[PDB]
Amino acid sequence: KVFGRCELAAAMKRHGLDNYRGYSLGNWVCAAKFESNFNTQATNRNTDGSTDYGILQINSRWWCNDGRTPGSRNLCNIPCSALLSSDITASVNCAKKIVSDGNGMNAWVAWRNRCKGTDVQAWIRGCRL
Ligand SMILES: [Cl-]
Numbered sequence: 613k614v615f616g617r618c619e620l621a622a623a624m625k626r627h628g629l630d631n632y633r634g635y636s637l638g639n640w641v642c643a644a645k646f647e648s649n650f651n652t653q654a655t656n657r658n659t660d661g662s663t664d665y666g667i668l669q670i671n672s673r674w675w676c677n678d679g680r681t682p683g684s685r686n687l688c689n690i691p692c693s694a695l696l697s698s699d700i701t702a703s704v705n706c707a708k709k710i711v712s713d714g715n716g717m718n719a720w721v722a723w724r725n726r727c728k729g730t731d732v733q734a735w736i737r738g739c740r741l
């Protein structure tokens with residue numbers, strides 16, 4: 613599923629992401645924009661052989677099981693394929709764990725490089741919600 617901007621903002625809000633660990637809704641929408649272009653099916657292979665999955669490009673090195681990342685963990689206790697669903701519940705629940713791990717949203721390199729220190733509220737501006 614490719615979400616609309618305001619559609620994704622609403623789904624994230626419903627699942628308790630606005631202001632989670634202090635990160636406003638626009639931070640999460642901005643992160644998703646640059647990680648997946650709002651496509652729940654986005655997958656990308658990393659140099660290390662791990663793979664990033666879903667709307668927030670959650671990595672198989674620590675967070676989900678894909679069966680093909682040696683020496684990995686599955687800290688969200690989920691198959692990586694659950695992160696590609698049209699229903700974002702699994703991605704949101706696992707993102708809550710990630711952003712609580714100590715470095716906040718800097719866990720997402722694209723958030724640090726493309727969202728952090730910008731007008732992230734632009735990403736939810738005009739949205740009813
Ligand atoms: Cl915001």
Ligand SMILES: [Cl-]
Nearest residue numbers: 633715716717
């Ligand atoms: Cl923080």
